[PDB]
């Protein structure tokens, strides 16, 4: 499925004949469920049925909930992403601490490389090389916090030395929003392979239930950074709309132009195979 359905009108959502049924007072739309990739519920004026939700969960549709300010606040978490789900669990519980370290660190390296590539892209040839240096000094589970130093540098270079990444502004709001979209994509994909998302590689179960998704999405963060950077002078509502480009656009991955959700599926499946010690090379994503 390939559509991102955005609902922000007072309406009743229901299910009939394999269709999502949208009823507003004005008009009415039927959308075939197999066509839908993501269902995004922006507003608090929407009714929906539990039948619909069941069927949404059956098809593997990412469902997002929002608050009063149209920021996302949660997602549906299926319990049983497969019929074979028991098998992967046992494997996941057996992931060795050394292999988790290898994989996690491999992944963070890709993130830093992509942060650098993005800096290069904005004609900061110099600070870009600096990040590559921080990357070369990485050791397992990054005890030195090279990731965090790389990030602080990266963000100061992009948005000036006045900028923290904890300050209340349109730029951070945008970044956060985009990052949540990504989170949701990978949370879905993980569950679909039979893994628990609560169990992260570096911190399992630490202050949140989606640690493993956060770990996997790391290399993709710059995709959102790019978009926000390009709209850094815009209002938040525009930033938000521009961010949906993530689902419309295609990106180079394994020599092919692929849609982001499809990349995330392949990426996740292979990361999981490597953690399971069924194969070696961690897959690479570069911007």
């Amino acid at each position: 499925g390939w559509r991102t359905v955005v609902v922000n009108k007072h309406s009743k959502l229901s299910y009939k004949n394999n269709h999502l049924v949208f009823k507003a007072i004005d008009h009415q739309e039927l959308i075939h469920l197999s066509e839908i990739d993501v269902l995004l519920l922006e507003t608090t004026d929407i009714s929906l049925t539990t039948m619909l939700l069941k069927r949404l969960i059956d098809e593997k549709i990412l469902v997002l909930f929002c608050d009063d300010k149209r920021l996302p606040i949660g997602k549906i978490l299926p319990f049983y992403g497969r019929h074979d789900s028991s098998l992967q669990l046992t494997r996941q519980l057996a992931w060795t601490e050394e292999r988790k370290g290898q994989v996690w660190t491999a992944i963070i390296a890709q993130k830093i490389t992509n942060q650098s590539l993005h800096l290069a892209q904005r004609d900061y040839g110099q600070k870009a090389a600096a990040l590559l240096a921080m990357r070369a000094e990485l050791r397992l589970f990054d005890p030195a916090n090279r990731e965090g130093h790389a990030a602080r540098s990266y963000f100061n270079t992009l948005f000036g030395n006045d900028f923290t990444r904890e300050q209340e502004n349109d730029i951070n709001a945008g970044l956060n929003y985009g990052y949540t979209l990504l989170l949701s994509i990978f949370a879905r994909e993980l569950v679909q392979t039979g893994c628990f998302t609560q169990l992260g590689l570096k911190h399992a179960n630490q202050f949140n239930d989606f640690n493993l998704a956060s770990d996997l999405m790391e290399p993709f963060r710059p995709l959102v950074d790019q978009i926000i950077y390009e709209n850094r002078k815009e209002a938040f509502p525009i930033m938000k709309r521009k961010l949906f480009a993530l689902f419309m656009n295609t990106y180079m991955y394994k020599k092919k132009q692929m849609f982001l959700t499809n990349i995330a599926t392949d990426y996740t499946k292979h990361v999981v195979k490597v953690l399971n010690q069924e194969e070696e090379g961690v897959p690479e994503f570069g911007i």
């Binding site: 955005v6 739309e29 075939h32």
Partner: protein
């Protein structure tokens, strides 16, 4: 790049079995996500040729073996050149190739 599958029918109604056969087939069409363009005339958006071959297969499986039922494959581009001599264009989401949709906005 997207395809459209255009399906047209004239199906008999005389007998009870003819009628049942029809109701079943139409039900299948709706459930497969075909859209009524006109009465007896339905269209289905498809992604790739893989999906198309697959649908054609499902169609043979649920062939009602009555009346005249014809299929035409065409590119989304071809379909988009459709001329509305009269009546309003169909702006239902299901009829568009848009990846991002908004029920509202």
């Amino acid at each position: 790049r997207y395809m459209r599958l255009l399906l047209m029918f004239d199906m008999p109604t005389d007998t009870a079995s003819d009628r049942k056969a029809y109701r079943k087939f139409r039900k299948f069409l709706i459930n497969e996500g075909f859209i009524m363009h006109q009465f007896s005339v339905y269209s289905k958006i498809l992604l790739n040729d893989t999906a198309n071959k697959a649908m054609l297969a499902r169609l043979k499986q649920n062939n009602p073996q009555r009346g005249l039922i014809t299929l035409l494959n065409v590119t989304e581009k071809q379909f988009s050149r459709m001329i509305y001599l009269h009546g309003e264009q169909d702006n239902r989401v299901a009829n568009s190739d848009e990846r991002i949709v908004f029920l509202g906005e």
